[PDB]
Structures are given as C-alpha cells and as structure tokens.
Amino acid sequence: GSNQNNF
Numbered sequence: 001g002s003n004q005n006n007f
C-alpha cells in the first residue's frame with residue numbers, strides 16, 4: 001500500500 005505523513 002501507499003503512505004502519507006502530514007506533519
């Protein structure tokens with residue numbers, strides 16, 4: 001799967 005971090 002794909003991942004995204006939004007800090």
Ligand SMILES: [Zn+2]
Binds near residue numbers: 001002003
């Ligand atoms: Zn993955």
